[PDB]
Design a protein around this ligand. Structure first.
Ligand code: R9A
Ligand code: R9A
Ligand SMILES: [Cu+2]
Ligand SMILES: [Cu+2]
Ligand code: NA
Ligand code: NA
Lengths: 620, 620
């Protein structure tokens, strides 16, 4: 009966039914996004109203609509026609992916370009890539994808080994017209294959790995009820799933004695962007908002046992809508398991004679998605000691180009003639905080060095300072690793036994933020990515740091517009938005398939508890 | 037959025998340090000469000696009398620990101080703490320990809950005299117990944790030969152990096809210091060089199976000397196991139809040591993909004080009246590099932002720059997290298939370095801790960043003196010294026993290999 339960197949077909009955889902309509809305604040008292939000595209060229449906009541709550030139195009549709290659294959300009390179059109794959917003005035209000070409020598060949540089095309996927074909000159198409299952390249497979077996003879220590409610080692939460954000955690709380204490109301990765740093006009427009433009949840992998997820795994199989409003299950799309995490606490005391050791564990909730060449794992971790962590695991195949004769300041060489343009992968975690409830505030904490002198005659003292962020105008913050900067979210009305406000401290990795010039299109479209930490006052319509419609949408929406309201955040219902990412200068070791690299953040209790919360963990 | 084999009990008793025969180890002599020396450069050609270095203390007050013995040849190579006022006192002896409490228990000043606080002397434990170098001229050339008092209410009580603030004593442990007793005034001795095995404090232990079983039905994938030579998944190394440094890795190399390629010649934690940031005269002298002053290897725990180390564990049991030169085994003092490390690489390709997933693993080599209240785990990790990592796990019981009425800028409150002074734990990793051999150099790599303009019209380009550190005077470097600063160690004479020098990139955590005023005693004694990265030219006598004798030793030795030589490091046999640490403002959650916190660093291949080194890893 939980209002935070996953969407069921039945609910999706019912949204379809309601939209049809209302005249909003005829044969020319396509669902570009569909997801359940979270309950309103204070809704617990009233009965359930399961509401769904839908973006409806029209293949005949009519204006799309944003629609909210009550599936409980069988009604349309609201429907509004969108002006996409103003507020943004709808997310890329799965069905549009094939269209770029298909249209290009009979375009005379494209064919001339392929013929100049002696490339068989039947062997040329075209990546359907988001277009962004640049200088092409004809694209405003049109659904455009840009195409970069890669040669596939045979059906099982990795096309990424054979980029066709110097060539890019722009296509209108609604009118089905090729708008531009740009050919800046021929580059050699790299010839070596990148087939990482071919014995010629791998050599003989290792026979040296002996089995590791991880089992739980009594089953897992967590329970799942109501489909998605998890209880594990004092933690309580609901695991949601949304086609845009992927796995979303709701109602993260910790049972401290007899009281269920909220910590985070909602945690998600609300955006991720991959800006490229190659100034070639073939790629200088490239910025993939995997979450906002493509919808990472839609491409979640079905995860195989003993392969993607090892141990005693409990799976969830979230349901999403296809383009027509029919439910589609992502079988085994979410993994849940607990795992050992080494030593938790240890002391061998000389005076008491007591030797004490306890083991740590973490609950893991994850999914893996594939967006073209990229594959990303999204992992949430809950630890015995109250720590909450996120980790992103980046792998897949690097996006390639030619490697220029004479080298490049913006591209690395992977193989003979084969380049990998420099890029970043930058995430935004949206943390709707509820430290002991909704009345929260954020302080920035810096280490403070002290001068040798009176009060500090030996020059050993050091301290720290905390600055409360009182209003949104003061809440756009940068990292300072040198001063050990962190941010504490506390509840000023909830004190621990030592009369101090309870809190959690956010520890960032302090990786570089968005590198692009601040006057670039990407600095405006991904403004969030220019600063490490933002704090807003909660509002129901402030969901994504880039706004609701990212595809081909200029600046104007998202975090910079939210904070202009300059609202009170000092003891209020607030949301922390943390930017973190990887800056990738690809190495030869990343080719032909990339070993995982990671980035993330964590939050640790900071006077939240009255003493260690793991004193009751048993030995051995 | 390996010259890198662990010291045997037989070798230690033979050093004892040689020293005795030579007249250097009579009844008043005590061994304060004993360890095997590494083979000289180019020694492989010649037959083994196992040499041991020994620091010999004299309990009658005679000058100590530094002695080198050839155990192979049964000879004393060299013996030199030390002037400790100049070059430093010998490491603290285990036998001196009890002496501080014992002497103080019949000192009238100490007894007066305890009586003023109504404390039974039989219940007062005294910590034997390193003294450092301050303003007390009488201490120069004398072996001093300082004592801080903690009340133990009964034999099994945790004394750390009951610090006796406002009181400190200084003791000469050779002449066995109390030099000073300082009483700045009474503070309340905190009364709450910190007994983390007492059911009153823990409450009922959890019954919710179900077993996790980790087994290897065919045994481990690594082999051990010659006692300490490890071969695992293309890696090759020797696991050494030294009473000062603890676990030391030698000859880390990777088998790439048919060639065994060196990476690191020697890896160790060559120092660790814990500076305290409380300006109270009771603690303002407190800086524990756990490695240099106490010898972390000497206090390595015997690690219990399924408790400290989980899985299919192979143990080593290193042998050290006691104070008289008799061998003592640390049973199960080193853990070795491999463990699963999630996904290694993954891609689901739309064009080829090939779905590919591979699992990662790491080899773990660790030990755990206890120094008073502190317990530290030292972990070395080798990954399938060529990554090398170190991690330190800090736990134990926090060092306590009174919490002042009216608060403190330098102490946090843990419990009523109970304080925890702010401090850091700072490590120095000494990495004697051998990237494809000994001809190495280091570059500092920064991300480079680019301005929108000609050549970069869209303002998206970014790049990087590398600066070769050519001489030691230019090789003292600081972190810059904002610019993504790393350091690459390469071999300029060994190129990969793309004609680029092979390399490894060091990724630091960029935590704060030493906070103390640069004119303090600790900034001089722990000068290494003020900068993130140092590079020296290799020399056999440059072992520790603080020199050979740290105890009561001023500046004058260590890294600052080594780099003054301004030697060539551009394509030479070099050593990287990386400073990294934790800055600890204790939280209520750290009490009464601290959950593990971590810090470390890693090195990843950077064009070392000609493509991914894990293409030959099998499925499932
Ligand atoms: C942003 N960037 C840089 C980017 C760069 C490049 C691309 C891009 O776009 C985003 C892509 C989203 C993630 C990536 C796409 C998201 C998933 C959508 C999906 C699918 C898609 C595309 C396919 C395909 C598929 N299949 Ru498949 N197959 C073949 C050829 C092309 N298939 C589909 C339709 C018709 C025929 C087939 C077919 C025929 C024989 C063998 C395999 N297939 N298929 C069918 C049945 C069972 C299993 C499969 C299967 C299994 C693995 C791979 C392909 N197919 C399943 C699901 C973005
Ligand atoms: C730098 N800082 C901040 C610092 C702060 C505070 C202290 C300090 O100093 C560094 C300490 C080094 C690590 C810390 C010290 C390094 C280890 C040296 C060791 C031992 C040491 C001190 C003991 C003791 C010991 N024992 Ru234990 N015992 C009792 C009382 C005090 N013992 C030793 C001698 C005589 C009698 C006993 C005895 C009697 C009954 C029960 C237990 N003991 N002992 C004996 C046999 C078997 C097992 C034990 C045993 C097991 C656990 C704890 C104690 N004993 C074993 C090893 C440094
Ligand atoms: Cu990347
Ligand atoms: Cu600490
Ligand atoms: Na909130
Ligand atoms: Na070297």
């Amino acid at each position: 009966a939980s209002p935070f339960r996953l969407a069921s197949a039945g609910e999706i077909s019912e949204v379809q039914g309601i939209l049809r009955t209302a005249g909003l889902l005829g044969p020319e309509k396509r669902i570009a996004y569909l997801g359940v809305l979270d309950p309103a604040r204070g809704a617990g008292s009233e009965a359930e109203d399961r509401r769904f939000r839908v973006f409806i595209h029209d293949v005949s060229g009519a204006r799309p609509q944003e629609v909210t449906v009550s599936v409980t009541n069988g009604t349309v709550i609201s429907a509004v026609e969108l002006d996409t030139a103003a507020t943004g195009e709808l997310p890329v549709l799965e069905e549009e992916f094939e269209v770029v290659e298909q249209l290009l294959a009979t375009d005379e300009r494209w064919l001339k370009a392929l013929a100049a390179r002696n490339l068989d059109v039947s062997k040329v794959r075209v990546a359907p890539l988001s277009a962004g917003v640049f200088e092409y005035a004809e694209e405003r209000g049109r659904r455009i994808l840009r195409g970069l070409a890669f040669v596939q020598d045979f059906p099982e060949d990795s096309a990424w080994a054979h980029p066709v540089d110097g060539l890019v095309a722009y296509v209108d996927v609604v009118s089905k017209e090729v708008t531009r074909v740009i050919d800046t000159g021929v580059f050699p198409v790299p010839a070596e294959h990148g087939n990482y299952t071919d014995p010629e390249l791998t050599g003989p497979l290792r026979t040296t790995q002996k089995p590791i077996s991880i089992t739980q003879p009594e089953g897992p220590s967590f329970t799942v009820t109501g489909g998605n409610h998890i209880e594990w080692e004092k933690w309580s939460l609901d695991v949601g799933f949304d086609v845009r954000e992927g796995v979303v955690l709701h109602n993260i709380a910790f049972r401290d004695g007899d009281r269920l204490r909220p910590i985070i109301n909602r945690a998600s990765i609300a955006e991720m962007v991959v800006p490229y740093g190659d100034p070639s006009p073939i790629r200088s427009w490239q910025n993939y908002f995997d979450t906002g433009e493509y919808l990472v949840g839609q491409y979640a992998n079905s995860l195989e046992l003993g392969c993607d997820c090892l141990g005693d795994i409990t799976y969830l199989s979230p349901v999403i809508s296809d383009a027509f409003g029919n439910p589609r299950e992502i079988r085994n799309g979410i993994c849940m398991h607990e795992e050992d995490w080494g030593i938790l606490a240890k002391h061998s005391d000389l005076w008491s004679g007591i030797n004490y050791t306890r083991r740590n564990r973490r609950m893991v909730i994850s999914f893996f998605t594939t967006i073209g060449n990229y594959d990303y794992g999204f992992y949430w971790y809950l630890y015995l000691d109250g720590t909450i962590e996120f980790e992103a695991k980046a792998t897949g195949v690097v996006f390639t180009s030619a490697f220029p004769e004479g080298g490049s300041d913006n591209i690395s060489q992977l193989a003979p003639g084969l380049g990998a343009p420099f890029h970043q992968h930058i995430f935004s975690a949206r943390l709707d905080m509820a430290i002991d409830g909704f009345t929260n505030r954020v302080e920035e904490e810096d280490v403070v060095r002290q001068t040798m002198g009176p009060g500090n005659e030996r020059g050993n003292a050091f301290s720290r300072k905390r600055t409360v962020l009182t209003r949104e105008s003061e809440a756009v913050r940068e990292a300072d690793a040198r001063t050990g900067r962190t941010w504490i979210i506390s509840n000023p009305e909830s004190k621990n036994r030592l009369n101090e406000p309870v809190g959690y401290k956010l520890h960032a990795h302090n990786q570089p933020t968005l590198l692009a010039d601040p006057g670039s299109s990407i600095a405006r479209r991904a403004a969030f990515a220019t600063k490490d930490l933002w704090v807003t006052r909660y509002a129901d319509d402030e969901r994504y740091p880039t706004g609701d419609f990212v595809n081909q949408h200029s600046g104007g929406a998202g975090l910079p517009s939210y904070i202009a309201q300059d609202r009170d955040i000092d003891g209020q219902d607030i949301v922390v938005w943390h930017t973190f990412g990887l800056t990738h200068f690809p190495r030869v070791e990343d080719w032909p398939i990339m070993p995982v690299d990671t980035v993330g953040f964590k939050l640790r209790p900071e006077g939240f508890f009255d003493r260690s919360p793991v004193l009751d963990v048993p030995a051995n």
